[PDB]
Amino acid sequence: AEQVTKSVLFVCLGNICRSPIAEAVFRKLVTDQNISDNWVIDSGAVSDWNVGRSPDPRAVSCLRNHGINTAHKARQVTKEDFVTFDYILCMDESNLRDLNRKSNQVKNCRAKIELLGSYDPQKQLIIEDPYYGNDADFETVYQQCVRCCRAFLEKVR
């Protein structure tokens, strides 16, 4: 077994609810397909408000419900992110606008930035912020992530 090394950065506003879910789901996909050795995976925030923090407890228990774990600490997206990741996948239009803006200040930006939901076979473009919702909202986010992440992987795999 030998290939090339790819990388994806999952992005949300706070990197506390959504992207940690996407990231963890994605590591699990890769792990299950015996391709971890060829992937660099990470998640970050548009905002710096929550850096250093662990993931919302509802996100942690949602993943646990699905047999998945995470040890993520919130971090901010940085300028080098744009030259080091193959892809930057975000949750909603606001994240999208925000990243595009930053990436501009980036000369040799090589990252492709897109909505993770653009990969949804069900076409639910946006991954709604679950912060003020309840346990079922987290569950629905997990579900979207699963669909989108499987779809994404099948095409760049």
Q: What is the dihedral of CA 80, 85, 89, 92, to 10 degrees?
A: 10
Q: Are 92 and 57 in contact (CB under 8 A)?
A: no
Q: What is the dihedral of CA 110, 27, 91, 113, to 10 degrees?
A: 10
The helix or strand, by DSSP H or E, that contains position 149, with its residue range, turns out to be helix 135-156
To 5 degrees, how large is the angle CA 100–CA 18–CA 37?
A: 85
Residue 156 CA to residue 153 CA, distance in Å, equals 5
Residue burial 106-141, b: 16+ Cβ < 10 Å; e: rest: eeebebebebbbebbeeeeebbebbeeeeeebbbbb
Residue 47 CA to residue 72 CA, distance in Å, equals 16
Residue 11 CA to residue 18 CA, distance in Å, equals 8
Count other Cβ atoms within 10 Å, centred on residue 57: 8
Superfamily of domain 1-157: Response regulator (3.40.50.2300)
Q: What is the dihedral of CA 125, 131, 137, 143, to 10 degrees?
A: 50
Q: Are 55 and 72 in contact (CB under 8 A)?
A: yes
**Nearest CA-CA partner of 75 in 122, 42, 32, 100:** 42
Residue 63: both structure tokens together: 């993943």
For the annotated catalytic residues, the residue numbers are 12, 18, 129
**Nearest CA-CA partner of 74 in 7, 15, 10, 153:** 15
Which residues touch 80 (CB under 8 Å, ≥6 apart)?
Answer: none
What is the number of residues in the chain? Answer: 157
Three-class SS state of 13: coil
Residue burial 24-44, b: 16+ Cβ < 10 Å; e: rest: bbbbbbbeeeeeeeebebbbb
**Nearest CA-CA partner of 143 in 48, 16, 37, 22:** 22
**Nearest CA-CA partner of 153 in 22, 17, 19:** 22
Longest dimension (CA), the chain: 44
